[PDB]
Amino acid sequence: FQPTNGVGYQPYRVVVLSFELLHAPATVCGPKKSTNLVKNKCVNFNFNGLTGTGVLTESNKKFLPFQQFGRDIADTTDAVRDPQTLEILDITPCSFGGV
Amino acid sequence: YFKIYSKHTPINLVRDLPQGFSALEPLVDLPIGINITRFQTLL
Ligand SMILES: *[C@@H]1O[C@H](CO)[C@@H](O)[C@H](O)[C@H]1NC(C)=O
């Protein structure tokens, strides 16, 4: 590495960012400002990057101390745990039907 | 990543593992990156 080396031979500093979801709490988060929670209404929700649309209601499910979100047979999120409140919320898809 | 699941249960038996079924729930996930091929116990 001499300063007169061709750009193809000049030194370049490289940084590689790899993102990881583990079997553990998500602790790295973006700067996006959080908002208050609304229940029993159709909303566009983003829980820790888990995005979707539906109605958030109080659940009677029993997540284990680690479980963050549930799923349905379709592989869709059926319920979640609020990152700011240790409560479990059921997601009901917004009412729809043929016209 | 070293994942550690565990389960505690009362027993009354002095011979060997009681027969039955019970699931172990995860408790720890250590981001060690330490390669492992052997282990040992300490009593
Ligand atoms: C942050 O969230 C936790 C949830 O476990 C809560 O206990 C705590 O009061 C919250 N802090 C603030 C400043 O809202």
From Swiss-Prot, chain A:
Cystine pairs: C42-C94
UniProt region (Disordered), positions on chain: 23-45
Q: What is the effect of changing N5T?
A: Reduced host ACE2-binding affinity in vitro
Variant or mutagenesis effect after changing N5Y: In strain: Alpha/B.1.1.7, Beta/B.1.351, Gamma/P.1, Theta/P.3, Mu/B.1.621, 19B/501Y, Omicron/BA.1, Omicron/BA.2, Omicron/BA.2.12.1, Omicron/BA.2.75, Omicron/BA.4, Omicron/BA.5, Omicron/BQ.1.1, Omicron/XBB.1.5, Omicron/EG.5.1; May enhance affinity to human ACE2 receptor
Main function? Attaches the virion to the cell membrane by interacting with host receptor, initiating the infection. The major receptor is host ACE2. When S2/S2' has been cleaved, binding to the receptor triggers direct fusion at the cell membrane. When S2/S2' has not been cleaved, binding to the receptor results in internalization of the virus by endocytosis using host TFRC and GRM2 and leading to fusion of the virion membrane with the host endosomal membrane. Alternatively, may use NRP1/NRP2 and integrin as entry receptors.
Could you describe the subunit structure of this protein?
Binds to host ACE2. RBD also interacts with the N-linked glycan on 'Asn-90' of ACE2. Cleavage of S generates a polybasic C-terminal sequence on S1 that binds to host Neuropilin-1 (NRP1) and Neuropilin-2 (NRP2) receptors. Interacts with host integrin alpha-5/beta-1 (ITGA5:ITGB1) and with ACE2 in complex with integrin alpha-5/beta-1 (ITGA5:ITGB1). May interact via cytoplasmic c-terminus with M protein. May interact (via N-terminus) with host bilirubin and biliverdin, thereby preventing antibody binding to the SARS-CoV-2 spike NTD via an allosteric mechanism.
Q: What is this protein called?
A: Spike protein S1
Section of the entire sequence shown: 497 to 595 of 1273
Swiss-Prot record, chain B:
Where do the record's glycosylation annotations fall on this chain?
N35
Top-level taxon: Viruses
Please give the subunit comment from the record: Binds to host ACE2. RBD also interacts with the N-linked glycan on 'Asn-90' of ACE2. Cleavage of S generates a polybasic C-terminal sequence on S1 that binds to host Neuropilin-1 (NRP1) and Neuropilin-2 (NRP2) receptors. Interacts with host integrin alpha-5/beta-1 (ITGA5:ITGB1) and with ACE2 in complex with integrin alpha-5/beta-1 (ITGA5:ITGB1). May interact via cytoplasmic c-terminus with M protein. May interact (via N-terminus) with host bilirubin and biliverdin, thereby preventing antibody binding to the SARS-CoV-2 spike NTD via an allosteric mechanism.
Summary of the function given for this chain in its UniProt record: Attaches the virion to the cell membrane by interacting with host receptor, initiating the infection. The major receptor is host ACE2. When S2/S2' has been cleaved, binding to the receptor triggers direct fusion at the cell membrane. When S2/S2' has not been cleaved, binding to the receptor results in internalization of the virus by endocytosis using host TFRC and GRM2 and leading to fusion of the virion membrane with the host endosomal membrane. Alternatively, may use NRP1/NRP2 and integrin as entry receptors.
The molecule here is called Spike protein S1
Origin species, per record, is: Severe acute respiratory syndrome coronavirus 2
Name of the encoding gene: S
The portion of the full protein included here is: 200 to 242 of 1273
